[PDB]
Design a protein around this nucleic acid. Structure first.
Ligand SMILES: [Mg+2]
Ligand SMILES: [Mg+2]
Ligand SMILES: [Mg+2]
Lengths: 49, 49, 464, 59, 59, 28, 67, 115, 257, 44, 436
RNA sequence: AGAGGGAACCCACU
């Protein structure tokens, strides 16, 4: 369960799928901190691109 | 190079976006007697277009 | 010192004599860090629990921290500071008699109001800003109510019968300058009436209103694309370089002046006047950051009325007040009602402590009105009483320079640029609106491929 | 227009309430706006973020 | 290389506009540089500069 | 020789004298 | 510039009241007492005379262009 | 530039009919009267006079837009009674009321003046 | 299914206002009467100004506006006059217009007040309410103002200069018995002039079956018409409108049937 | 035609395409006269 | 040259029923350009319904919008079938409606839907004429005797289209009603239940007619379609706006004022807070202050004083909100959700509160003092920017200056963030423009 | 019988 918020180190330590999941988590956190909600499909599409 | 490089160059300012015909612009005012898909248009603009 | 300054005239005792007596001192910012300052000579220097007993200087009045445009706000400490900033911005756009010398000055753009009024609720700083000599705005009976939904968001419902009586009517002045010149040895420009057979390029406009010297006389009605100055340049038989009016002007020639420039050439300036009756879409503002356009105009028979037959000139929506927190607007309304009933001019200096909402309410209750300023209004259309009681009172509003007749624009086809063969830019050049990158992106998200093709290829220039 | 009375200003077709303080250049009224600048002849000490100098004093 | 906007056409729309234009200050910090510290209302502006009168936008 | 009760009159008389002498474009 | 002919609110004639209002103020009436003596009871009609600024006196100071 | 002339609020130009009657197909015994170049002054008084007829089931008026000048009046009556007859009776009734009020006001003026 | 029989009592009758009460009628009829008072009573006002000379400090359309707002005596010939759109006189005729003439030139040193008394008409029946004087413009020495003016017939729907009245006071149910308005604190409100309750109690008890009647009026004239004849003209105009509507409705019934 | 002099306020006959100078005025600014044709104004 | 034959093209003027594209800059999302139908009106302004001003992010304080006229049957059909306003009621960004009931209509809907509102016969007919989808049958009144009286819930049930079933809650709904008794027999009528297209109970507000997921508008769209939802919007606005002429709405001094008991309670709370801050200052100066876990002396001191001041502001705001009557227009505006909030009510009536610059209390711009009027090393609430006066009582000039300093930060942030956000949006779009 | 330019800078609107 130990994780960071640095994208590049998560990438170079764990891999491309893990950094995709981490990027999705960080984007969801920075969006939903304001109490706003966005659909999952847009975040998934951005992270996949 | 300056004719192509930045904003309002040939690419960004004349190809991706450009000034168009058959357009109009004026101040908006409320009208609660109109449906949500209806827009009030002044007679001079409707005569010009 | 106070009595000698009271007898200021016929005694030549003045501010210089006050400073030289050693009672008033100039302090800059650096020296201000080493002084102890007080709001009030006695309210901060009496005997109480000790805060500071080593005061070195005292403020004259704390309301001198405001500038020129912020000194016309009544009760500015009862408002939100962004709204004070917005009013300080919009006070420079308020229309009125800008100078007493306006009949001689041939300024390029000018706006003068028919009936300016000094505010009923004023600040003591206005006397030194000469606001009572050159006012910009009219006191209006303002009722804050939700009447027909045409004042929603920031909009304003106006009284048509008031407007027909001269309410917020104004004149727009524009000046055109034209200078004949000998630019070339064989190129001469002359002021003359153009004739069709002797002029190479003559537009479809009429030249009958001109005189023989090529200048239109004062007192002649002019309209769109008319000719006001006839200037022709010879062709090495003559090319016409006459100037025309702005589109949809529809004015009257006010003054025509002829003179010689520095080079010794003939110089002509023509001023054209146009009246501006307030319309739907004209922008109006309070002294508290409450701006908005005119949503609709109702006649006097349709506007709500009180028991005495008073109908408001202007109805504003109550939704503007709670989020913006401009309570100074309501206090100005209440003080204006008290001042108009009493017969005096209300005082709205910022930090007074001698005026309170309770005191103003107690003063209003003596004149036979409800102490909080509410009144029982009747429906204009049906005559039935309105269940809620409407807050109504006189409030100073201003007319701003932004009118809808200076902003309405439309184009089907017209002039194109020389280089890229796209439509021109601007209202005055009969230009087209821009379909920018964000609009292209929005149409991409729409999926309207042929609409996006027409806007970017067919509505604009096609080529083969 | 220096030192003239209101009657003299009106006879010269000038507004008595006009404050003055501007220039007439080619017939257009031009005003000079004051520009703020750092004061001279005084020692200031600052500190920059990524500069190689820990503390700098300038005059 | 020269500064711009030092001299401006005097605004004659109304008397308050004329007075405020005649009593205007300017900071030569560029509008493209985007920092909150020069634009903030400092404590030292008590009684020297109006705390309310400022343009809206990039300036 | 002190003005404890009436101060508004004295203050605005002083301010009126200042604006009568100096003006509003005095710095320019 | 000049006093309006009618009140903006109710249309009552106030154009003829201005000279008498100035005369009463010269005769040292209170402004409220002068407004009641002129017959103005609605505060709209009262503010029409109370807030008026007569600029035509300043405008007549300049010499006319014509003879 | 788009300001309509002020006489179009009350003047019929060529081509418009003052009143047009259309039946209502949703419910029986209902008609819609469309009155041109009129407003709340006639609409409210006609509606209030129509609400006094016990054989009138529905009566109301509306203005579709304040910028335009027309009224829609929808009248629904009981069977054996027609909305056109109800409208005619209401107008005659209001004319009689106004005539009575006019003559009584004239009598009151003559009583107050020199009496 | 028939009309009420309204009764009217008059309490005050001066040269400037009428105070009268109408009982046993509808709120809609009362509101129709009070809004015909404002916008459906024809008077005579200046609607055509042609200026030959204007050297004053006020411009031509400013002067024309101030002239059009001047009230005129229209007591008896307003019915004899015809609308310009409904009479055979092209441009203006004495049956479709009244001609005014103004000619003032300031030769004297102190300023001359151009008033409504300087307006001169051909017909003796129309006076600009001078049996003080409405100020039009002030003239310096050397200034001149000459013009012609024509007066038409119209009502307050077209323009507010044809409004024959000042503010019209209308009131029903002075003591809130029908509860058409709800006071959150009834003790805080001043009582009306027509209130019939004691000073102790704020409102009348609620009346469940009551309907509005006994409508109170105060019609103030601006001087164009007598306030006694404003009401008579209003009633005649409303009756004429209803009769015209009846004629058109009957013709439509016979046309479609 | 005839123009009005600057501070003389005097009519002077001026020929076209000639320098603008006032008769017994030292002043270089002259104004045009009011038109003789009639203009109709509407009080609304 | 006026002869016309088949195959010719006539460039006629734009008439009623034409389809146009209506756009407002900046164009942040795809509902900023929607298709409208043209209605020709007098005067020189564009007219639009108050519902569609929310996706356009527009207000009528001088805004301008652009009209685009499609020139072919191809693109006219495309705008008609893709970009019409009813087809963009529900956004794909957050699967919720983007247009809702706002302003006067919302504020009057809550009053119309209150339980004690009773309508009589003529008012019922007048309201029923403004229903486009009315079937011409007058419903049975809720009360038949002594006199026929209708209820606003009956008329709004007539407004509701189809057989929509929905359950929402009012904003003033107590949290203990559902747990305890009276769960389905509501005392305050704060539980909205719509069954079979009829409004059984509840008071409508933002939470049922707004732009939130699961709203009445959302369920109406998802169950009936865009045409019926458009008719629903128009009927709501027309009927409620015409009833607002009878009802009335306002704001005034009496809404912003309170009673003397509440005023003395607020003053006592402010006095107690200032005394507590003085005691904390004394503890700090006498070296009796024990730092909180994980902070220095300055941090724990600022945290303690900020906690005291925030608790004081919250307590005064709660007292002020309790002091409001049921006729208070501020409370009506807040409860409807149209405009305003409880902190706005608190700042109007009781205490404006502490002013902050860069998320921090007012800094010493002079040498160890905020202003020359204060004495050196003063950490009290008055010196560092706490405003103890409401807007009604008036901000005292030091409080005015500190409030201006506070508002300048918000103006600066609003001026600054736009360019960075626009650059980010452009980069994202140019990265993912062709993904399909 | 479709005239008829451009660059720079400043101010202002949402
Ligand atoms: Mg919005
Ligand atoms: Mg907005
Ligand atoms: Mg806006």
């Amino acid at each position: 369960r130990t994780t960071s918020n640095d994208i590049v180190e998560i990438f170079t330590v764990l891999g491309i799928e893990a950094v995709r999941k981490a990027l999705e988590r960080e984007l969801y956190h920075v969006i939903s901190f304001d109490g706003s909600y966005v659909n999952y499909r847009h975040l998934a599409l951005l992270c996949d691109t | 190079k300056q004719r192509l490089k930045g904003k309002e160059g040939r690419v960004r300012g004349n190809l991706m976006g450009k000034r168009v015909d058959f357009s109009a612009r004026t101040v908006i005012t409320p009208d609660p007697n109109l449906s949500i898909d209806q827009v009030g248009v002044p007679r001079s603009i409707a005569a010009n277009m | 010192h106070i009595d000698q300054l009271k007898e200021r005239e016929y005694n030549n005792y003045s501010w210089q004599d006050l400073v030289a007596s050693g009672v008033v001192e100039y302090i800059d910012t650096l020296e201000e860090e080493t002084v102890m300052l007080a709001m009030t000579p006695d309210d901060l220097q009496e005997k109480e629990v000790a805060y500071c007993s080593t005061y070195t200087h005292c403020e004259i009045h704390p309301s001198m921290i405001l500038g020129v445009c912020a000194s016309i706000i009544p009760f500015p400490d009862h408002n939100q500071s962004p709204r004070n900033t917005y009013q300080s911005a919009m006070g420079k756009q308020a229309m009125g008699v800008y100078i007493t010398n306006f009949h001689v000055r041939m300024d390029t753009l000018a706006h003068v109001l028919y009936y300016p009024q000094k505010p009923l609720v004023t600040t003591r700083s206005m006397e030194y800003l000469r606001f009572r000599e050159l006012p910009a705005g009219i006191n209006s009976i303002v009722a804050i109510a939700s009447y027909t939904g045409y004042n929603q968001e920031d909009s304003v419902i106006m009284n048509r019968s008031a407007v027909d009586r001269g309410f917020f009517r104004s004149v727009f002045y524009r000046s055109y300058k034209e200078q004949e010149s000998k630019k070339g040895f064989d190129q001469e420009e002359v002021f003359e009436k153009p004739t069709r057979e002797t002029c190479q390029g003559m537009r479809h406009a009429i030249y009958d209103k001109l005189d023989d010297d090529g200048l239109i006389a004062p007192g002649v009605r002019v309209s769109g694309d008319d000719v006001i100055i006839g200037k022709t340049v010879t062709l090495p038989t003559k090319r016409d370089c006459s100037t025309f009016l702005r589109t949809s002007e529809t004015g009257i020639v006010d003054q025509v002046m002829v003179t010689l420039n520095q080079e010794g050439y003939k110089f002509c300036k023509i001023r054209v006047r146009s009246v501006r009756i307030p319309q739907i879409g004209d922008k109006f503002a309070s002294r508290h950051g409450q701006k908005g356009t005119c949503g609709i105009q109702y006649r006097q028979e349709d506007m709500p009325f009180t028991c005495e037959g008073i109908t408001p000139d202007i109805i504003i929506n109550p939704h503007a007040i709670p989020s913006r927190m401009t309570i100074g607007h309501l206090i100005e309304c209440l003080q204006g009602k008290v001042s108009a009933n009493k017969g005096e001019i209300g005082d709205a200096t910022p930090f007074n402590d001698a005026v309170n909402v309770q005191k103003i309410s107690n003063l209003l209750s003596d004149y036979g009105y409800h102490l909080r300023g509410n009144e029982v209004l009747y429906n204009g259309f049906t005559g039935r009483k309105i269940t809620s009681q409407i807050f109504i009172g006189p409030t100073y509003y201003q007319r701003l320079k932004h009118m809808v007749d200076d902003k309405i624009h439309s184009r089907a086809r017209g002039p194109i640029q020389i280089l890229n063969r796209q439509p021109m830019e601007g209202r005055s050049r009969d230009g087209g609106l821009r379909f920018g990158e964000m609009e292209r992106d929005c149409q991409i998200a729409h999926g309207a491929a042929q609409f996006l093709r027409e806007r970017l290829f067919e509505a604009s220039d096609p080529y083969q | 227009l220096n030192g003239l009375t209101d009657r003299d200003l009106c006879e010269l077709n000038e507004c008595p309430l006009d404050p003055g303080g501007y220039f007439i250049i080619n017939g257009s009224e031009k005003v000079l706006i004051a520009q703020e600048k750092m004061a001279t002849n005084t020692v200031y000490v600052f500190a920059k973020k990524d500069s190689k100098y820990a503390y700098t004093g300038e005059c | 290389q020269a500064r711009a906007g030092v001299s401006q056409v005097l605004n004659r729309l109304t008397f308050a506009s004329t007075l405020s234009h005649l009593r205007r200050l300017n900071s030569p910090i560029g509008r493209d540089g985007k920092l909150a510290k020069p634009r903030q209302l400092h404590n030292t502006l008590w009684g020297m500069v109006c705390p309310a009168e400022t343009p809206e936008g990039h300036a | 020789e002190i003005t404890p009760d009436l101060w508004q009159e004295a203050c605005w008389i002083v301010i009126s004298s200042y604006f009568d002498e100096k003006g509003l474009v005095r710095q320019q | 510039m000049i006093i309006p002919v009618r009140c903006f609110t109710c249309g009552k004639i106030v154009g003829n009241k201005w000279e008498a209002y100035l005369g009463l103020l010269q005769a040292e009436y209170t402004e409220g007492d002068a407004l009641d003596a002129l017959g103005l009871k609605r505060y709209c009609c009262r503010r029409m005379l109370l807030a008026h600024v007569d600029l035509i006196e300043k405008l007549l100071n300049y010499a006319p262009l014509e003879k | 530039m788009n300001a309509p002339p002020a006489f179009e609020s009350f003047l019929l130009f060529e081509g418009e009919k003052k009143i047009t009657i259309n039946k209502d197909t949703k419910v029986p015994n209902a008609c819609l009267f469309t009155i041109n170049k009129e407003d709340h002054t006639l609409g409210n008084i006609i509606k209030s006079q129509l609400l006094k007829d016990p054989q009138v089931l529905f009566a109301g008026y509306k203005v579709p837009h304040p910028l335009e000048h027309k009224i829609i009046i929808r009248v629904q009556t009981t069977p054996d009674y027609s909305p056109q007859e109800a409208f005619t009776n209401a107008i005659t009734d209001l004319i009689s009321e106004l005539s009575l009020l006019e003559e009584r006001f004239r009598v009151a003026i003559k009583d107050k003046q020199e009496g | 299914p028939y009309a009420n029989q309204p009764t009217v009592r008059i309490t005050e009758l001066t040269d400037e206002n009428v105070k009268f009460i109408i009982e046993n009628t509808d709120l809609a009829v009362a509101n129709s009467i009070r809004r015909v008072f404002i916008a459906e009573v024809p008077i005579i006002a200046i609607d055509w100004v042609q200026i030959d000379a204007n050297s004053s400090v006020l411009h031509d359309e400013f002067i024309a506006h101030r002239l059009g707002l001047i009230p005129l005596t229209s007591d008896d010939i307003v019915d004899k006059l015809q609308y310009s759109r409904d009479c055979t006189c092209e441009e203006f005729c004495p049956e479709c217009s009244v001609e005014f003439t103004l000619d003032v030139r300031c030769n004297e040193d102190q300023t001359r007040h151009v008033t409504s008394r300087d307006l001169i008409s051909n017909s003796p029946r129309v006076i600009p309410v001078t049996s003080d004087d409405i100020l039009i413009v002030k003239l310096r020495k050397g200034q001149e103002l000459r013009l012609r003016a024509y007066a038409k017939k119209g009502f307050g729907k077209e323009h507010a200069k044809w409004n024959p009245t000042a503010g019209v006071a209308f009131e029903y149910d002075p003591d809130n018995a029908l509860r058409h308005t709800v006071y959150p604190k009834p003790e805080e409100w001043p009582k009306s002039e027509y209130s019939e309750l004691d000073e102790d109690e704020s409102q009348a008890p609620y009346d469940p079956n009551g309907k509005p009647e006994r409508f109170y009026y105060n019609v103030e004239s601006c001087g164009s018409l007598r306030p006694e004849t404003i009401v008579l003209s209003a009633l005649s105009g409303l009756k004429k409108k209803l009769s015209d509507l009846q004629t058109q409705l009957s013709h439509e019934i016979q046309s479609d049937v | 035609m005839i123009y009005i002099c600057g501070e003389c306020h005097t009519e002077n006959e001026i020929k076209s395409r000639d320098p603008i100078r006032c008769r017994e005025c030292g002043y270089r600014i002259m104004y045009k006269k009011r038109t003789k044709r009639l203009v109709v104004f509407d009080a609304r | 040259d006026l002869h016309l034959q088949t195959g010719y093209k006539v460039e006629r003027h734009m008439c009623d029923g034409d389809i146009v594209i209506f756009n407002r800059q900046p164009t942040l999302h795809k509902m900023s350009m929607m298709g409208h139908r043209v209605r020709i009106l007098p005067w020189s302004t564009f007219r639009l319904n108050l519902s569609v001003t929310t996706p356009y992010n527009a207000d009528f304080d001088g805004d301008e919008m652009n009209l685009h006229l499609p020139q072919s049957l191809e693109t006219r059909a495309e705008i008609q079938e893709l970009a019409m306003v009813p087809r963009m009621i529900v956004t794909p960004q957050s699967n919720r409606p983007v247009m809702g009931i706002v302003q006067d209509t919302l504020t009057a809907v809550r009053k119309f839907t209150k339980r004690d509102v009773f309508l009589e016969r003529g008012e019922v007919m007048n309201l029923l004429m403004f229903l486009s989808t009315w079937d011409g049958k007058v419903p049975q009144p809720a009360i038949l005797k002594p006199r026929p009286l209708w209820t606003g819930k009956q008329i709004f049930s007539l407004i509701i289209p189809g057989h929509i079933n929905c359950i929402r809650t009012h904003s003033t709904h107590p949290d203990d009603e559902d747990s305890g008794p009276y769960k389905h027999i509501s005392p305050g009528d704060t539980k909205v239940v719509v069954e079979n297209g009829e409004l059984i109970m509840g008071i409508l507000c933002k939470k049922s007619l707004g732009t939130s997921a699961g709203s009445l508008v959302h369920i109406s769209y998802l169950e009936m379609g865009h045409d019926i939802t458009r008719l629903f919007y128009s009927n709501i606005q027309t009927v409620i706006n015409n009833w607002l002429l009878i009802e009335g709405h306002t704001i005034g001094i009496g809404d912003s004022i309170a009673d003397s008991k509440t005023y003395q309670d607020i003053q006592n709370t402010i006095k107690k807070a200032k005394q507590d801050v003085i005691e904390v200052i004394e503890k700090a100066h006498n070296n009796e202050l024990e730092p909180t876990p994980g902070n220095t002396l300055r941090q724990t001191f600022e945290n303690q004083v900020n906690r005291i001041l925030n608790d004081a502001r919250d307590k005064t705001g709660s007292s002020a909100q309790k002091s409001l009557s049921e006729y208070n227009n501020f409370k009506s505006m807040v409860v409807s959700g149209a405009k305003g909030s409880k902190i706005n009510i608190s700042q109007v009536i009781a205490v404006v509160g502490q002013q902050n610059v860069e998320g921090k209390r007012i800094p010493f711009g002079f040498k160890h003092r905020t202003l020359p009027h204060f004495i050196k090393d003063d950490y009290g609430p008055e010196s560092r920017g706490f405003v103890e006066n409401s807007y009604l009582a008036g901000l005292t000039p030091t409080e005015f200056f500190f409030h201006a300093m506070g508002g300048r930060e918000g103006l600066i942030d609003t001026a600054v963030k736009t360019a960075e956000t626009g650059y980010i949006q452009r980069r994202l779009i140019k990265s993912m423009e062709s993904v399909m």
